[PDB]
Amino acid sequence: GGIKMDTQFYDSFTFDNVKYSLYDNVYLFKSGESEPYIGKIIKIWQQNQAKKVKILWFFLPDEIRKHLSGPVMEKEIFLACGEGVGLADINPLEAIGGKCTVLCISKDERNRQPSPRELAMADYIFYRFFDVNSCTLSEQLPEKIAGVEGNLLLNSKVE
């Protein structure tokens, strides 16, 4: 059955007293699991009464341990890239447990270089990207990930 006039999209939302905007990073929780997953909000919408978020995935080292072949930094995670399962998932808004501070330390000029203070206060850092199809890490930021320009997936415009 076709659907029209049932959906709208948002730049932000407010939930459990917190203000979440596009490209913010969040903790997401699966049912029955207390250990969180890390994601980036790339789309926010409501269809009928169900609010959803499209999550571009961050992978913790423990999530991809059998693919690691070298040392990882303290608090390092990896931004998903490429195509296929594991890149992005549509989640209910209620799955978001809270906001997560993920700072990019990539040398790429499209990235705003954060302060050592910002790095010390960040929950996680990243400069490598996990191809969900080949399960390989790379330091090269793609032009686009999940249809979003790469420059929008790094650190914020202002500090």
Q: Is residue 110 part of a domain?
A: yes
**Way it was determined:** X-ray
CA distance 43 to 54: 5
Residue 61 CB neighbour total at 10 angstroms:
14
Query: Which of the 8 DSSP states describes residue 28?
Result: E
Q: Is 153 exposed, middle or buried (0-12, 13-18, 19+ CB in 10 A)?
A: buried
CA distance 101 to 118: 10
CA distance 116 to 85: 35
Q: Is residue 26 part of a domain?
A: yes
Q: Give the resolution value in Å.
A: 2.3
CA distances from 116 to 46, 71, 84, 103, 105 (A): 38, 21, 35, 11, 10
Q: How far apart are the first and last CA of the chain?
A: 46
Q: Is residue 158 part of a domain?
A: no
Q: Is residue 104 part of a domain?
A: yes
Q: Is 46 exposed, middle or buried (0-12, 13-18, 19+ CB in 10 A)?
A: middle
Q: Which domain holds residue 110?
A: 7-152
Beta bridge partners of 129: 79, 138
Interior CA angle at 147 toward 100 and 36, to 5°? 25
Tokens read off for 41: 């909000």
Q: Is residue 157 part of a domain?
A: no
* Structural domain count of the chain: 1
Q: Is residue 85 part of a domain?
A: yes
SS3 94: helix
Place of tokens 């992978």: 59
The strand ranges marked E within 34-95 are 37-47, 50-59, 78-81, 88-92
CATH value at residue 76? 2.30.30.490
